[PDB]
Amino acid sequence: SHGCFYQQVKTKVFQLKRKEYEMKLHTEAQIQEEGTVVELTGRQSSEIT
Amino acid sequence: SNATTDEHGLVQFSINTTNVMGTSLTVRVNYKDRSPCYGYQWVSEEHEE
Amino acid sequence: VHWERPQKPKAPVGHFYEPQAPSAEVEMTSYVLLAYLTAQPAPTSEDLT
Amino acid sequence: NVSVCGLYTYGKPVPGHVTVSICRKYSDASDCHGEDSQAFCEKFSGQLN
Amino acid sequence: LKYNILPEKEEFPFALG
Amino acid sequence: AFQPFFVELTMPYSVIRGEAFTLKATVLNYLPKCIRVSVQLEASPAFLAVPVEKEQAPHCICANGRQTVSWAVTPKSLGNVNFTVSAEALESQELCGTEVPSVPEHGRKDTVIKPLLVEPEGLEKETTFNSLLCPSGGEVSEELSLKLPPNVVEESARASVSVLGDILGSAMQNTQNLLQMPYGCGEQNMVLFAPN
Ligand SMILES: *[C@@H]1O[C@H](CO)[C@@H](O[C@@H]2O[C@H](CO)[C@@H](O)[C@H](O)[C@H]2NC(C)=O)[C@H](O)[C@H]1NC(C)=O
Ligand SMILES: *[C@@H]1O[C@H](CO)[C@@H](O)[C@H](O)[C@H]1NC(C)=O
Numbered sequence A: 001s002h003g004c005f006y007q008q009v010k011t012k013v014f015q016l017k018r019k020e021y022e023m024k025l026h027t028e029a030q031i032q033e034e035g036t037v038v039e040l041t042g043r044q045s046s047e048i049t
Numbered sequence B: 001s002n003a004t005t006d007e008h009g010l011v012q013f014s015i016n017t018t019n020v021m022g023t024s025l026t027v028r029v030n031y032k033d034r035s036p037c038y039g040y041q042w043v044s045e046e047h048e049e
Numbered sequence C: 001v002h003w004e005r006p007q008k009p010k011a012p013v014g015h016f017y018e019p020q021a022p023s024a025e026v027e028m029t030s031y032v033l034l035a036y037l038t039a040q041p042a043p044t045s046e047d048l049t
Numbered sequence D: 001n002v003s004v005c006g007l008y009t010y011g012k013p014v015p016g017h018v019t020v021s022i023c024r025k026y027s028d029a030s031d032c033h034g035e036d037s038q039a040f041c042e043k044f045s046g047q048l049n
Numbered sequence E: 001l002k003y004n005i006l007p008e009k010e011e012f013p014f015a016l017g
Numbered sequence F: 001a002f003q004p005f006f007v008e009l010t011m012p013y014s015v016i017r018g019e020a021f022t023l024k025a026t027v028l029n030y031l032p033k034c035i036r037v038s039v040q041l042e043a044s045p046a047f048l049a050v051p052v053e054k055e056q057a058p059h060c061i062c063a064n065g066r067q068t069v070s071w072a073v074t075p076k077s078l079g080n081v082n083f084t085v086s087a088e089a090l091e092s093q094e095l096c097g098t099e100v101p102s103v104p105e106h107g108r109k110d111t112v113i114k115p116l117l118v119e120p121e122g123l124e125k126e127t128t129f130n131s132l133l134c135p136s137g138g139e140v141s142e143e144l145s146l147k148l149p150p151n152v153v154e155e156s157a158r159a160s161v162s163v164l165g166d167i168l169g170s171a172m173q174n175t176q177n178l179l180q181m182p183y184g185c186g187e188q189n190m191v192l193f194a195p196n
């Protein structure tokens, strides 16, 4: 209700290595009292150089 | 020559210049190669030079 | 027993493929195997041991 | 499709616990000196009746 | 040859308890 | 062969004279009768056995039923040392199952004499020597005396000599293998010339 969501994830599943590719990050809010959501398209170019 | 990082990584080298024409420069913190297992054809890591 | 070269080259070296450094580890002993060996009259115990 | 029937003295069925590691191999890691070649190995367990 | 050793080296210094 | 009811052990090929170890004696049943056992083993001077689950006597094991116990054991002698473990069925103690007739052969009890290895206690370690004495027309002699009894235990001191000429262990392969055509540049040419 006050503040916002938190989640400090683990990243082993990705295998941030040669041939698995750039990280796209799309978040979806099942808000209350509407059934409405939208999503924000952010941080998609996180080059693990 | 050798130097280190300050609080901001900032370094200020300087050079005595009584030399021949076409100079060409570089510095590194690692040696001139992708030190851990660079020859495999499947190596995914580096350091900028 | 044997000898090496000095067990590592002190400078940054190696990485793979013995580049400009074929490790030259035996011929050093081969000539030693001459060294203890060859003389004018004939050899002894210690040399041959 | 999997199973196990681990024989015993006289080929009897013998009780206990069991686990098994199906193992695909040689995945995207460089496999060399910091990288395990072991690819997706599902480990599946049984109780040996 | 072979043989067995280390029956010793259990001493009592202070060692801060 | 078979046995519908016996006892099996579980213990390594070898142990060390120093540290202690459990010996686990497992007892198995397959014939339909379900009977308690008095499984045990005589304690003999070449070791020290101590069980953990004696006072609680076994209950029973039925067809395709098996039990197991332990002996926190440690050896005393050195070498192969028999482990004679004895077990037998029982009668008129019908507390676990329905009945306990328990009338097997004269060999109703599986008493199993089994010799397992031990090494002497502690971190072992080696010691080495050598020689050469090649009189090509005369004589030579020599001596080698050998003592390290500081802070050891007895007679693990042991050794073994060698007598030979050592020249042929690699003679075959490298020789016959290594004859090749000349090709290549002057460098390669010498490289393949000179070995010959
Ligand atoms: C302890 O184990 C040894 C074997 O390590 C037994 O020695 C055998 O004895 C039988 C007769 O009792 C001989 O037929 C065998 O030849 C012996 N061993 C071998 C392989 O030759 C010994 O009997 C066991 N018990 C005692 C008390 O020593
Ligand atoms: C670089 O030079 C300094 C002295 O100017 C020396 O103390 C230091 O050891 C050198 N760096 C390295 C990597 O040794």
Ligand SMILES: *[C@@H]1O[C@H](CO)[C@@H](O)[C@H](O)[C@H]1NC(C)=O
Pocket (backbone or CB within 6 Å): B016, B017, B018
């Ligand atoms: C840098 O070194 C050169 C070496 O000849 C010297 O001539 C020059 O004076 C130096 N730079 C200075 C201290 O201004």
Ligand SMILES: *[C@@H]1O[C@H](CO)[C@@H](O)[C@H](O)[C@H]1NC(C)=O
Pocket (backbone or CB within 6 Å): D001
């Ligand atoms: C595999 O096992 C299933 C039972 O889980 C069986 O129905 C089938 O016939 C077996 N063979 C297959 C599916 O290849």
